[model samples]
Target chain A: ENRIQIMSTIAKIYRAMSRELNRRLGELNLSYLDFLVLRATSDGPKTMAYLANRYFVTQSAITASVDKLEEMGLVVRVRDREDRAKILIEITEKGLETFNKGIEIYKKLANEVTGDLSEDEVILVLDKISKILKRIEEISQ
Target chain B: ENRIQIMSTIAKIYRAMSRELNRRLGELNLSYLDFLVLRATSDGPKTMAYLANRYFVTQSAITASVDKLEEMGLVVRVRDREDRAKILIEITEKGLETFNKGIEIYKKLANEVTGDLSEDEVILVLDKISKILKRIEEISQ
Candidate 1:
């Protein structure tokens, strides 16, 4: 019963967060998934497979997202020098600039969502989620 | 930095949970949204507007979900005797039976995800999430 309650609560929170995030992203002419893709590629080049795993999406979905990003000049697909058959994704300078600008808005929104909780409360929640994540990882493996 | 970490962790966990839930639901020929709608209506009849608000989805999306459920013979739309303009949704016996079966699978999956946490740890996380939910409710109001 406790587990069911927890799952239900988490689902509600996730739905609320998703709605608000999508609204915010709408104002910037981007989807939440686009924000994730841009953020993931911001650091360095990543393969489609890497992104598919990171986002827990299919390769086709990642391909579509990369295609959209490329169309918007936010990302580029480069040939991997080490593996000629592999295509790597790198964020463009414009992508970084856009991500930097958008991330501030994202952070502000997240802060608002979590603002009611104190540092201690946040830490407690984070610790529990981290442990849950670890267990999930173990099971998936 | 801590807030950012919290948001990132939450997003990752949400994505993982969504992927696994959808995969399990796929075998039942249902989408996650369908499961939510079915589960929500299982207890009693609900209005399309009520479900839209409860699920934090658009009215049109809820309409589509209801239409799909009705087509599947899992739900039915009945006229509200009190309000002629309003339509109420009722789950069929088949819907309830199907939901009962699916919920067991869902609970088992959720258990696998959260089974590693102790009772105290689960309570701690639930408390923090409840606080966050309260804040979100306040703001939304």
Candidate 2:
């Protein structure tokens, strides 16, 4: 019953976070998925395969998202030059600008959601979540 | 950077949980969404409006899911005797059996994910998450 309660609480929180993020992102004509892709490529160019694996989505899903990002001028796709078969996705300047703006919104929301917690409480929550995430990875493998 | 780390961890854990649940439910030919609907109605019948609000989905989304459950003979929609215009959904015997089985798998996964934590750790995580969920609800309102 404790586990059940924990799982239900996780589910509820996850949904609530997602709903809030999506609503905030909608004003910028972006989505949670779009934010993810942009954030992933923000540091440097990445291949579709890498993104698919990292996001646990199919290549087609990544391709579809990238296509939209490309259309919006937030990302551009180019051949790997040395490996023409591989396409690399790079975030545009506009993409970086938007991502920076999005991060502010994200932080504001996160702070509103988590601000009440003390630093020690946040650290405790993070530690426990890390353990759960580690277990999940092990189970997945 | 702290917020980013927290958000990334939450997203990873959320995806891992969803993936594990869906994989387990696949054996029963049910999705996570389907499992939720069946579980919601397992104890007693619920109206479509109530389900849509509870599940944080559109009425059409709940209708689509319930339609699939009805097709599978796991649930049925009946006219509320007090209000013919209002429809209520109930789980069938088969639905209950499947839901119970699915719950075992769900609990197994949840326990595996959270098993390493001490009682105090679990309580701490729950308390923080409760605050987050409460904040989310307030934001939605």
Candidate 3:
């Protein structure tokens, strides 16, 4: 029962975080996923496969997401010269500016959340959670 | 730097777990959100408002989720005789079966992640994470 409660609580945490993240991004007319996509694309041009791999989404899902971004003028698709079948997606200047602004907002939000935790406590949290995540990924794969 | 690393690591953990859950549920042709909605409705009839509150989603989001489930033949929405304005959603027998199967899969998955933890360790994790999640929720709100 304790474990069950803990699992349920963790699940709730994720849901709440997603909901809050969406709420914050709503002002910018973006969902959490969209923010992630844009943020990933901020570095440079990336292929559809690359973005899909980075985000752990299916190819089709990534394609659909990229399509939306393209429609919104946040991204542009370039055909790969080396590989005719591959598509390289580049974030527009507008997209880069938007993501930079978004990150500032995200940082402010993150600081507010972690403000209460001591430095040592925060490190401990990261260590423990990282181990758990690795274990989870091993199972998942 | 350590604190930021911790924060980033926590995000990785969240991403890994979400990917794990999504991959497992993919076999059932369900997303994590879809699975959550089905599980929420599996127990008994619930008003859209009740489901929204419990799932921490907007009423519109819940209605759309339920509509998808209805189309999938997993649920049915009936008018509440007591309240004309309220819609009661009941999980179909197919839904119950699917949910029960999903529960078994989840229980197995949960056991793998948590079975190694001592009772005290589990309690520690639960207490620490619950505090963090609660703080984040308050800030986000």
Candidate 4:
């Protein structure tokens, strides 16, 4: 029953953790996708299509995320002059500040989550999990 | 090094996997949350609040999911007869059919991801990971 019990337990935990993480992020008045979009654009201006591809989302999906950010004044959209059809997006100064703050919170939460593990145990867990993750990625690809 | 590597690797793999998963689901015209909502609803009718709690998402997040499912004609929301302020959601026949098909694909994908592990090794991996998940949940609660 390990297969059933373990999988179910892991699934539940993942969902729960994801929910809490989103809740914490929600306090910043950003949906998870919006947060990601701001982070993606925070580095600099990037074409909308480029961001869509980067996030593996459709143009429409990316459009919606970016549009919401724009409405919130976290990002601005600019059309490429050379290619009238393409839109470039860049995070606003406020957006960059928000992202940095969010990253700080994320780091703090991450540290709290792993606080129970000793340094060596943490490494061992990470190594084993990395092997598993790599295997999944390779197989999926 | 191990701790840092594990943390970074976990973030990378989760992001990669999430993006890939969403992309694949998108091809079928489903968002990951949409798929999850439909799947969870197939068992029986659930309230907006119930679904939100089950998914560890906010009520607003659940409302958005329900709204999308409603538009897809895969779910129907009804006024709760007992509680006027509450709405109960049920999967439409279309939703049920979708879940059946989705479950098949999910199982296949899960199998592929775990294909390399021997039965006992799979058990070990699942158990260990499940323990971590349990810890996360315990702390979250």
> Among these predicted structures, which one has the highest DockQ?
2
Q: What tens digits encode model 4's per-residue C-alpha lDDT throughout B3-98?
A: 335444555455455555566677657776777788778988888777777767678888888888899899998786888777778999998887
* Candidate 3 Cα misplacement greater than 4 A, ranges: A2-7, A27-29, A56-61, A67-74, A92-94, B1-15, B22-31, B38-45, B53-81, B90-101, B114-119, B139-141
Docking class of 2: medium
> Once superposed on the true structure, which residue ranges of model 1 sit more than 4 Å away at CA?
A57-64, A81-85, A137-141, B56-64, B81-85, B137-141
Instruction: Tell me the deviation in Å of residue B8 in model 3.
Output: 5.0
* Model 2 alpha-carbon drift over 4 Å, by segment: A57-60, B58-60
Across residues B1-141, which tens digit of lDDT does each residue of candidate 3 receive? 554454445555556666777778778767676788888887778888878876677888887888888998988988868876767888998988887777766776666666666777667667767776777778656
Rank list by lDDT: 2, 1, 3, 4
C-alpha TM-scores of all predictions: 0.85, 0.91, 0.73, 0.60
Q: For residues A14-126, write the lDDT of model 1, one tens digit per residue.
A: 66776677777777667777878899999898888989898877889898888988999999989867887888899999999878877987788668878878988888888
User: Quality of candidate 3's docking, in CAPRI categories?
Assistant: acceptable
Candidate 2, residues B56-78: lDDT per residue as tens digits? 78999898999999999999988
DockQ scores of all models, one per candidate: 0.52, 0.64, 0.39, 0.27
Instruction: Kindly list the interface RMSD, in angstroms, of each predicted candidate in the order they appear.
Output: 2.1, 1.7, 2.9, 3.9
Candidate 3 vs candidate 4, TM-score winner? 3
Best-fitting candidate, measured by TM-score?
2
DockQ of 4: 0.27
lDDT of 3 at B29: 69
lDDT (tens digit, per residue) of candidate 2 on A1-141: 766666677777777777888999988778888888998999999988888877777888898989999999999998866888878899999999999888888888887877777777778888788888899877875
